Write a protein that binds this DNA or RNA. Sequence first.
RNA 1: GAAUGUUACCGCAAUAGUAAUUGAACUUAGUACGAGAGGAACAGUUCAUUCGGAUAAUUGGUUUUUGCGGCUGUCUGAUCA
Length: 128
Amino acid sequence: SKVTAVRCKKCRTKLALSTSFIAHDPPSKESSEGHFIKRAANSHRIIDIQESQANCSHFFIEPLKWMQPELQGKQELEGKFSCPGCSSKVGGYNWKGSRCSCGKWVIPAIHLQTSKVDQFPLQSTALP
RNA sequence: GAAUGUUACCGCAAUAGUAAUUGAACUUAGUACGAGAGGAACAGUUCAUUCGGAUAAUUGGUUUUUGCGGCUGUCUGAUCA
Ligand SMILES: [Zn+2]
Ligand SMILES: [Zn+2]
């Protein structure tokens, strides 16, 4: 396949490129990975039995040269980020959670939404 | 409405009643929250629902202004009236 590029919606600015987006094997589904576990106040009690969704509603990327000044200035645990040419939020940063939309705990990495975010091929269109 | 000197004007306020009501839209903001889907609020600005008090510039209704005009039948000889 050919290379792609992911950009923002309501604003025309290029956010990131291809050679990213690890698939990371979304389903396992034994008893607890496909279930959105909400532990209660005591006794490791699990009330909410929510099946995980089928679609992958997040993009998983690498740290970026546009992400370097935000990571360098006033570093905290979890926050939010946006576009420099706009003010529409694209997600947040974390190194201890913010699992997926499918919901597995992964290595510390930056996520990207696909709500108010779209993707386009870097080459020309197919011209139907 | 009698009576309080007569009459006239301007007032006080004891007591009694009392009335306003609810919903939207924009902005706040697709922001907060939320992994995402979704998804607010205070303040501000417009209008609306039910109720109430008044008013008649305009619009509508009403017409014994019998005000002006028209029409039928008949009577005043015709015309006019
Ligand atoms: Zn933007
Ligand atoms: Zn996934």
